[PDB]
Structure formats: C-alpha cells, structure tokens
C-alpha cells in the first residue's frame, strides 16, 4: 500500500528553568522508530521500534550528530524569532517542524512536505512544488528571503525526493512483518439506558492498525453525523488504536440503527446492529 | 494561541478484575507543551508512570500518552490529574471502565 516517513521537532525556550528543550520523534506511518530528547541522559538518537535496532553504530553516530546540529539551529532560531516579534527575554516560546515524504504501492515518491510553526501558528511552509516557500507573516518573509538566497528548497527537495524515499524503502523492507501489516478493528456494541424514553448505543473499534478509521451511525439508511458522539482515536499502548462512536436512541427503536466501520484491515466494511 | 488538553482515561485491554493490564491517560490538543500528568490509585500518586515522546497534530497541538501497569480490582479507584497554563486548578478525570 501507500507509506510515509515523518519527523517531528519541538523546540521550547524556558528562560530561568533551564536550557531550551528539544524533542525529535521519527515515524514510519503510525509507528515511531526513533526519538531524541535534550533532557534525557543519553544525548543520542534512541531506537523506539525493533526493526531500527539492526542499524549499525555509524547510523546512530550520524543521527545523533545531525539531530544535535538541528537542536542548535532551533536554539538560535528561538532567539532570532524573539527578535523578529519583539518578545520579552523571559517568556517561553515554541518552534515546531514537521517534514516527510510519501511513497505509493510501487515504492516510488508521491509527495514531500516541510512545515514550520511559531507559538502554535504557521510560520513558513515548503510549497507543493518543493521549489518555493509560503511565509505566514512579515517575520516569516525575512526567513523566506534568507532561504531563497541560500537555496533551501533545492536542499529540501533533494532530500524528500532522494534520501527520504531511499530510507523509507529500507525501513519498510526491514520492518515488513509489522510496518507492511494491517490489524482490523475488533468491533463490539454496548447498550447504556438513560431513561424509560432514551438509551445510548456505543460502537467500539479496538486493536486496529493503522489509526485511520471511520465509524458512522445510520438510521434506516440515513447517516447520523450531527447526532453521533465521536471520541478522538487513542493509542492502546501496544502499537494499536481504539475508537468509539455513540448515539442516543429512542428506547424501542434500537434495531433501526446500524454502525458502519471502515478500515484498511477490513476487506469489506462492517455493519453492527444491536 | 493557548489550547486546553483533552483527557481520556482508559485501559489497553478490556478490564478483567484481578487480571494485569495498562492504565492510559491520553492528553491531546493542547498548547503550549508544558504539562503535568499524574496517575492516581485511590487519590494517591502512582510512583512509576511512563510517557510517550512529545508529538503534535495538523493544528500544531500536542499529544502524549502516560501509562502504567495496573491490575484493576472491583473497588480500587483510578484517575488522571492534569495541570496546564490553561487550567485554574489541576483537572481530575476518573477512570470509567465503560469508556
């Protein structure tokens, strides 16, 4: 199927508490394989998936060296952005970076992306063309001009279309038994009466991988989109996900309702009735 | 801006009394990243609680999983105590095993 490799970076200044913190998380689809935390004792890029452990010391040395070099870029950027926005030296500010690349079933490049935020708002983004930048304000316009002059898009595109896809392809092959697997949802329904007039019908999807799932309630064929309570997909802790969808039904009409489960682990969508 | 955390207190596997499991606290959709999360057993702080590595969503808001190995009993009460700039007082969310 379709696959992706994504890296998430968070840089937080904490004036007076400590040094700016840096967390780097690496993902292949919905599986984390690497981590770096400036607060942790190792000061190395650490393995978080079993299929990355087979990578030699030169991989680990390279990743540490490079993720350290990035944290240093982000530390000077925290200072640069405080200066752009005329913010106080005593406030806490946060830079967030996400980049990655997608491959199809053939293993060929699909899309590449690079997005940056400052204080939870868009800052600068690499455009779909991988050739230009979109600055969200006057300050991100200064950065845009720096990056245009430094040929940052050429550097980013060469990585996303080359090195990123070549690494993703290696990870998918080494991690085949887990990465190239789908776990279908283990569905069940539960009845929770509210009164003599109404009751709750909760549809559960547990143990599924990847996290993408659609739970839909229907009544005689019509979707109940406006009246379905949906929880956010949550991690089970073992690499799988959980989700539920609930709907309040009139006491003698439970049989008029069906829940539709859509997952790539399922060859045909499921339909649950009480 | 500043976004309030969303809290979910649940177990890895469906709860069976006297059977070993994992108690999860999933905090999501918050900004800034600075947060305090404690897992409690009868209002008392659980000593060894592990957490995931900080990540974020399409809106830039963060998420984290805090977990501990626990064995659910019939009478023992479990909860999550969360603190964030966004809260007047830390928020206690109790573990409802039918959620």
């Amino acid at each position, epitope marked *: 199927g379709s696959h992706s490799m994504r890296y998430f970076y968070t840089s937080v200044s904490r004036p007076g*508490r400590g040094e700016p913190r840096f967390i780097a998380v690496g993902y292949v689809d919905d599986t984390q394989f690497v981590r770096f935390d400036s607060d942790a004792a190792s000061q190395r890029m650490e393995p978080r998936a079993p299929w990355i452990e087979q990578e030699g010391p030169e991989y680990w040395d390279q990743e540490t060296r490079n993720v350290k070099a990035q944290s240093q870029t982000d530390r000077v950027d925290l200072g640069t952005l405080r200066g752009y926005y005329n913010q106080s030296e005593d406030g806490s500010h946060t830079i967030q970076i996400m980049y990655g690349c997608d491959v199809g079933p053939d293993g060929r490049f699909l899309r590449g992306y690079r997005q940056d935020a400052y204080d939870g708002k868009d800052y600068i983004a690499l455009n779909e063309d991988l050739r230009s930048w979109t600055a969200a304000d006057m300050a991100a316009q200064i950065t845009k001009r720096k990056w245009e002059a430094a040929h940052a898009a050429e550097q980013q595109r060469a990585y996303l279309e080359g090195r990123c896809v070549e690494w993703l392809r290696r990870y998918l092959e080494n991690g085949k038994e887990t990465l190239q697997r789908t776990d279908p949802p283990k569905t069940h329904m539960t009845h929770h009466p509210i009164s003599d007039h109404e009751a709750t019908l909760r549809c559960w999807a547990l143990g599924f991988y990847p996290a993408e799932i659609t739970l839909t309630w229907q009544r005689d064929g019509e979707d109940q989109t406006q009246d379905t309570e949906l929880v956010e997909t949550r991690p089970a802790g073992d690499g799988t996900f959980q989700k539920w969808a609930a709907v309040v039904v009139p006491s003698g009409e439970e049989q008029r309702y069906t829940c539709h489960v859509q997952h790539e682990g399922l060859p045909k969508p499921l339909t649950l009735r009480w | 801006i500043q976004r309030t955390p969303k809290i979910q207190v649940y177990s890895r596997h469906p709860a069976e009394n006297g059977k070993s499991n994992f108690l999860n606290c999933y905090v999501s959709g918050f900004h800034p990243s600075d947060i305090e999360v404690d897992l409690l057993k009868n209002g008392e702080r659980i000593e060894k609680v592990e957490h995931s590595d900080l990540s974020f969503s399409k809106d830039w808001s963060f998420y984290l999983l805090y977990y501990t190995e626990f064995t659910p009993t019939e009478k023992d009460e479990y909860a999550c105590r969360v603190n964030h700039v966004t809260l007047s007082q830390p928020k206690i969310v109790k573990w409802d095993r039918d959620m």
Partner: antibody, heavy 121, light 115 residues
Framework: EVQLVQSGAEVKKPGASVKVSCKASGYTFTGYYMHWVRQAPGQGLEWMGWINPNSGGTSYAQKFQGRVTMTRDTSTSTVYMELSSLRSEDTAVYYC??????????????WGQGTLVTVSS | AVLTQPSSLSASPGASASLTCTLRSGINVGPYNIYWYQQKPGSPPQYLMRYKSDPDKHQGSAVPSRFSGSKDASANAGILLISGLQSEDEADYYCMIWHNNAWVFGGGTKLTVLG
C-alpha cells in the same frame, strides 16, 4: 507530598570545599530541574544555578562559574552542590529549590530547609 | 542594583502596606514577570504571585485575595499590595525577575504589622 531534605550545618576554613546534599521525595526525581539559592546571614537571596537530574546537565551564574559543581544520584534521589575555594563571604544558608515544569506562576515551588555553611579562619 | 526594595516598612493591623520593587533606569518594568516570595524566620522563601500585567498574572492557591500585584510604570516599579493587614503578614518580601541570563532578587523588605 513533595519533600526536599538537606544535610546539616557545616563549619569550614578559607580555601576549603563544602558539599551540600538535597534528598528529594514525593515526585519523579528526573522530571524536575533543581536550582540552588543562597542567603548570607541577615541578607538577601542569591541564585547559583541549576541541574537537570535526568541528564546531569548544569548551568551556573557567572559569579560561581569555576567554583561550583552540581551533581545528582538518581538511585538515591539526591542532588549535591559543592562550592570550592571558599571565602568568609560564602558564609550563608544554602537552599535547594525544585522548579516547576508547568509555566504559569511559581518558578521555585518546593524548597529544602536550608544548610548553614560558616566560612571562618 | 537592578531591583531595589525599601529595607523596611511598618503599618498597623487592618491597614494596607504597599511594597515596592523598583527596576533600574533603562530597564522597562512593563515586559517583565515580577515574582514575589514571602519569607518567615527560620523558613525557606515561599511563592506569593507572578505579575506581568492585569491579563497576565498568577496568584498562589493558598494566597488570599487581599495580596495583589500591580506595576507603577511612572516609578518603573512592581507593587505587592497587602490589604487588611494581619500579624501573619509580618515577614521578609523579595521580588525577582529573570534579567541578563540570571535570577535577580531585590534586597527584601521587612514588613512589620504594628501590634
């Protein structure tokens, strides 16, 4: 409850060194940075620097740079502050103060009881 | 000194004491978070409040509403106002700011409640 318990009073001579301990309890020791603040008898407060008890990373105030060492023992939940090449001007009560992770109000939230270090020829 | 506090202030029970924390000229009070810590004899210092501005402040859960923070921009100062003074309010009061890559304290003010 969070409790920070420090070692007993010390009497030292100029040029010597002092090692002050601070045993932490009632929280995850590695999750919070520990700072040191001193108070000269009948005077004000002076910040010395911090330790990350997880990494062992430190930062000292310009005045103590070269003379202070902050260390920790994760196994015993203890932080240590060691001031060397001591002078009578170093006579003070030395506090260890935990710093919050949530940035909203307090910085130093929990303090030790203090350790009096008397420097005298 | 960066932060200068009066050494002492005295006031009667039931009255109001206005404790000042003045910032040195050319260092504007406005942008900074001013922290107040209270110190009772033989005890370590204790947080009272953080004040940047009326929409950016914090007060400890155990700190009564009769303790309040402001800033007097004209004086370039931080203020801790203690109303309806009590005997338990007799203590040393330090103000602090994060300035020039270090925690900076004022000398402290000894507050005496005239009982």
């Amino acid at each position: 409850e969070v409790q920070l318990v420090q070692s007993g009073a010390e009497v030292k001579k100029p040029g010597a060194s002092v090692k002050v301990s601070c045993k932490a309890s009632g929280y995850t020791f590695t999750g919070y940075y520990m700072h040191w603040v001193r108070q000269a008898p009948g005077q004000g407060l002076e910040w010395m620097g911090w330790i990350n008890p997880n990494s062992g990373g430190t930062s000292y105030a310009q005045k103590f740079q070269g003379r202070v060492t902050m260390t920790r023992d994760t196994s015993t939940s203890t932080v240590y502050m060691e001031l060397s090449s001591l002078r009578s001007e170093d006579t003070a009560v030395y506090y260890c103060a935990r710093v919050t992770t949530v940035i909203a109000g307090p910085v130093f939230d929990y303090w030790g009881q203090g350790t009096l270090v008397t420097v005298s020829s | 000194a960066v932060l200068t506090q009066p050494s002492s202030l005295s006031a009667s029970p039931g009255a109001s004491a206005s404790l000042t924390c003045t910032l040195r000229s050319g260092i504007n009070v406005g942008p900074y978070n001013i922290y107040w810590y209270q110190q009772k004899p033989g005890s370590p210092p204790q947080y009272l409040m953080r004040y940047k501005s009326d929409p950016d402040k914090h007060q400890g859960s155990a700190v009564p509403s009769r303790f309040s923070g402001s800033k007097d921009a004209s004086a370039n100062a931080g203020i801790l106002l203690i109303s309806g003074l009590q005997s338990e309010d007799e203590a040393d009061y330090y103000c602090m700011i994060w300035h020039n890559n270090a925690w900076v304290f004022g000398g402290g003010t000894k507050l005496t409640v005239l009982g």
